[PDB]
From Swiss-Prot, chains B, D:
Belongs to the CMP-NeuNAc synthase family. It comes from the Eukaryota. This is N-acylneuraminate cytidylyltransferase. The BC2 (basic cluster 2) motif is necessary and sufficient for the nuclear localization and contains the catalytic active site. The localization in the nucleus is however not required for the enzyme activity. Transmembrane segments: none annotated. It is found in: Nucleus. Homotetramer; the active enzyme is formed by a dimer of dimers. Disulfide bonds: none annotated. Catalyzes the activation of N-acetylneuraminic acid (NeuNAc) to cytidine 5'-monophosphate N-acetylneuraminic acid (CMP-NeuNAc), a substrate required for the addition of sialic acid. Has some activity toward NeuNAc, N-glycolylneuraminic acid (Neu5Gc) or 2-keto-3-deoxy-D-glycero-D-galacto-nononic acid (KDN).
Amino acid sequence: EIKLLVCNIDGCLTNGHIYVSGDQKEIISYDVKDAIGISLLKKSGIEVRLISERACSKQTLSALKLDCKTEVSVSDKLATVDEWRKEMGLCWKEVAYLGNEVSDEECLKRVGLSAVPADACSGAQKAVGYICKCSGGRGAIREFAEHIFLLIEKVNNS
Amino acid sequence: KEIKLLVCNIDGCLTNGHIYVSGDQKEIISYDVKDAIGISLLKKSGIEVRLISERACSKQTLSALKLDCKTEVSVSDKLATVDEWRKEMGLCWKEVAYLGNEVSDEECLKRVGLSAVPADACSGAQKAVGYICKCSGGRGAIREFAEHIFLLIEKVN
Amino acid sequence: EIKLLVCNIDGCLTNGHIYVSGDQKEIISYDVKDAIGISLLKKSGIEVRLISERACSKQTLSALKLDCKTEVSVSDKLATVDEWRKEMGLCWKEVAYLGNEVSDEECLKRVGLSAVPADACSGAQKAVGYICKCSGGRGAIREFAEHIFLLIEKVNNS
Amino acid sequence: KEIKLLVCNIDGCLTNGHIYVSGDQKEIISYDVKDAIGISLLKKSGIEVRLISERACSKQTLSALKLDCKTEVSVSDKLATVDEWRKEMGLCWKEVAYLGNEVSDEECLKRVGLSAVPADACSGAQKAVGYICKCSGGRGAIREFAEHIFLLIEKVN
């Protein structure tokens, strides 16, 4: 199984670039490739949720049109992800996590399937068993999704 | 044989594939002036340029690029559409170039006289072509391919 | 002398990236380095003017806060630059031009001092005698400005 | 000697140096989350981080980065200011790191115990330092330097 994929926003969903104004309006972006990859995980029954340590601009979030439950301003990502885990009656082996930062490490080492984008910090890279050829905001979510579908194939054809 | 039609996939080829959001969010997309001019230069040399996508694309957003290119979006079957354009224009497959990136482009990439992908195209598309651009999608790949096409025209003449 | 520098907007002032919305609002950007370089040319008596073949978003232009007379939607850049030349009672040898595109070539080959950014088209590169190490929107204007001040030094210390 | 103060130039180091304009233009600037977290990590390890600029910089725009860093802008004489911060904090020059890019940073770059510039820093600044970052300004250079600093702390301990 994988039943949940949790994705860090800044650096996995996005390339980590922020564009900000004096009135605190922020622009961030995601790639079509990755949106498609989220669409396809959802289609197949895998819930995708977005997570962040940052105080992300309030509804820049919904403007993403990704239909994912999100939680920002997170200090203990293991706690919240474990809260999501308990909510969807889930097991740690069925939780996937794409991470990139030091604050992701607790989650990465704990989950059933861990990955990082090509440009993740050294510490997040050491914590995982799958390092994407693609970088954050540039196909890593799509790349990882296709890795996940390969695991479900293995269980299906077993 | 001389190129007379170029077909470009929209997302990740003409655009850089990104959707830029804020909240006052009419959505923003990004492209490179180099590529718009590449299209301009192809059209002036007598090469028709057309745009395509498997997905919805805002007529209005694309009109903002001022490319004056026949476009078809939400295209279920890209080869069927390009075939119909090819016949429409009285052309051979060898007279058709295709710059594409996604899997849905792969059939076309394999049939056309001249195929390419931008540097950051999916692995399947990269395998389907004779030319992988140095430049990435929405960041010079159309211009690069256009120049490649011009060099071929004078190599044959 | 150099008394006028003309700069193509897309690809010299900017990196040539356009960000556009369905309501045709455009975002473009310039680097602080280059703004400083324009400030410094102006301080020393050299007029800087901006030129474009493109139908640039109407007053994205003034929002640049660069204090340069501009003309967009230009089909014959040699004509207009020659119009500016005649207006400021100028000679072709005192006109400088930073260009990047095929449509810049007439101007580049004609002016007293020609340059292009590192990422200019092959054709614009062949037309000039100074190729910047810096790319468009990324220091080329500043780089070229410092090249111009070196020429005025040569005349001053002559 | 252990670093206890990092000073970063704002334009082209903390930001990518770009001013993004449109027309509804309150102006937009760009930075990298990697770098904000790099600052967060330095502060948590006990290293004070301060920002500086020879030019005006919007208090309000910078507050949007949520860095909680003492900042001085329109600074005529960067060495004089860093010297006053150094003394204020009871520090040696060897305890001070500086990431900078423009010419106005060069004096400081030469005095401090640990100097750096981002990849795209002016030629004069690059010459003034012991470390030129792979990453460019506003795109990971502060994080890169921060990690470099951490590696030094454990190399000495």
